[PDB]
Amino acid sequence: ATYAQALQSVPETQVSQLDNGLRVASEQSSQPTCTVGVWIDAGSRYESEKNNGAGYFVEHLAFKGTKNRPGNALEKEVESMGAHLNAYSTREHTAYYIKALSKDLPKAVELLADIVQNCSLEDSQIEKERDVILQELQENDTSMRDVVFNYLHATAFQGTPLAQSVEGPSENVRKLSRADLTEYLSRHYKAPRMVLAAAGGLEHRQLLDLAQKHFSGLSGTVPTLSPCRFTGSQICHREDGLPLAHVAIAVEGPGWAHPDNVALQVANAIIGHYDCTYGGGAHLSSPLASIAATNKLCQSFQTFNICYADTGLLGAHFVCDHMSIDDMMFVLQGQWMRLCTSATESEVLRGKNLLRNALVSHLDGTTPVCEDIGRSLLTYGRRIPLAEWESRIAEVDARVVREVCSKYFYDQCPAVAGFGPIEQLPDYNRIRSGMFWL
Amino acid sequence: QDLEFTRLPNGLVIASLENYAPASRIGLFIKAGSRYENSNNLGTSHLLRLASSLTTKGASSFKITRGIEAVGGKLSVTSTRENMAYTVECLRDDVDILMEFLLNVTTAPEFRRWEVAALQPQLRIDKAVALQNPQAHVIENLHAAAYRNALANSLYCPDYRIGKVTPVELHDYVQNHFTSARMALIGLGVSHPVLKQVAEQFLNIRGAKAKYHGGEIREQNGDSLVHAALVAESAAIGSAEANAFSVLQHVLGAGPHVKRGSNATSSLYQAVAKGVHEPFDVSAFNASYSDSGLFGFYTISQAASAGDVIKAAYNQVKTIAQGNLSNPDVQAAKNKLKAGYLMSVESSEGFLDEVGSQALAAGSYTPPSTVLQQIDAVADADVINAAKKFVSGRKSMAASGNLGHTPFIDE
């Protein structure tokens, strides 16, 4: 068989809906295992300074006390069942989810009603975790990568909610209340802005009853968004006492529904990535990467493409020594302007064939599948099948890229960050003057 | 769709599973782990594991680096103390090209001089990326402490070996160990007769035991935190006795199934939660090679609180060996085991990791259903032995960090 025939053979997902407002969907597969999760609309984007960091503080007590399975009894029933449990939060989205087997699935859905709705939030654990948090804000000083993106979001989106961190300042964590969480819980966890999704060896109707069983008791009845602007600003936490300097730079992103995000994910992959381990070295394809391997300028860099509602962030993160920063940027901008103007068709086919293996290999199992589902069903509306992701890409050519990069790289007002011996780090003005070829 | 599984007269296995998926995927599991290294060729597989993407006869280093990224594939390399895998990825529309790139690495590598010399000092980098994650010299020292000759040899390369490695030294290694009798041309997202055609054209070509001794190593490194491990001589795979440990693993502690979970069901981490009033992290250690395995646990704590913690674990296991046990914890622990197996092979990669690993140790693939029945047929009188073999058995130990209050075995 062939590639295009394979995508049509995929299990096309199934969607449901309830009177309360809770979207539900799934995807059957031949996997005997399964997973389920709850992707929603909530994060630091909606907390104010008074309740900042709270949704992260929710993450640590939701599994540490309920009304019908108090204490570690909840934690116990999973380990008795043999499954895992995991969670995370973002600046817009938060997610609890399970990996388990097919037959024991009904026991799972019964819990998330006891978790989401009927959390108990014992004052002891409120105070214990209040120390656990302050333990981590010392730890994340070490997580230098996470330092940067925290700084970066805090600059371009300054003055807005989105500049907030996700875990929040120490101060608010030392002033937080049961009631602010009650209010926060009482507003964001609501059916019209929540999603359930699962994958594996199940059926969409085994599940539909459980939502009609448990989450049917949900409160199915709320502000909308302020357009979070973008800023071009520089930030720099000079620190010479360290080995190296994690660095980042980025610009305005378009956002989720804007279709040219397909194109940009290529260009990030046209430039690609490299970190001090790939034996290709000189032989590599990304001209940036080859030079970095040639002269050993940097040690690692990465690109990205964040998507938020009306905007995102396009940029990169790179990591080098204090005697090499200027040249990497000169080369780095040297690539963006190249694609704004002179983009070889064959080099496009490189990235078009990178991105296919990205989303597919990204989708190896069930948990990644439900990441996309629980995310797309809050951003794009529908799910997008993989045959549709392909058709969009096949329309692409170098004519498109020269329009897109000219729209979002060229001459814009970028956002910069730096934490380390940035003594060589040039000024934002010089950086912008290096932004436009000629 | 079902899983083909065959064998040629040359001892060369093939399998294939045309799932009609988009992402083709191939993995060539081989017996070339560093156990086959002698004293003089150490730190070799660490180089050979990076010797991919070098000159061949049918192609150059450059062309392969680009020919893959054009189709946008990969060339990843897993390597164990037993084995050495050449995993790849691509879309099914261009498998024929990437096939040719692979075999030229394994079948016609020249291993010239100058490309190696540039590639040697890379070892200093790769060696240190791991040891930012401090486990990977504690754990090597166990093998180097417990076992002697084969498995004692680390995956990675000692310092001094760098700048002293020879290409001829590889041709002896390659011609002796990339051999049609002890290989496994697994594939995926691909039909079976194709692979049957490839090997017959290109792969049409032709070490000691792990003597357990009982050893002990210590590393006062000045690091604020502690890392330690105490083990005993385990059993090799294939034996249902092996699964008796792998279920005991889940009885005792298997790591956090729950994010930020107190691991309350785990008999070990629960057992230290009393008396201690500070952080620590610990779980069971289970290893199971072909000649043998290893079993025990891996500790994390502060300096002063090393033996204060270990003397719960070394006691907790004795409680089990003295018969003190319940059945639901076992069936719970089984249900953990039955989960993690399927959850591991949920992914094609983790699936692939199991397919040929059996094809090398065994010459047969066991579907997961049959695996679960052997788990169903486990005896508590073997789970005990088990811990009795651990406690009654000879011991090996290693640790790192500060050691101002770390005791030895006999203490």
């Binding site: 034996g279 290709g280 | 991919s52 060339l75 250690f285």
Partner: peptide
């Protein structure tokens, strides 16, 4: 844990 090495041409180096 049962440690395993992992390198590549494009997967970042890793330790299982």
């Amino acid at each position: 844990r049962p440690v395993v090495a992992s390198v590549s041409l494009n997967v970042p180096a890793s330790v299982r």
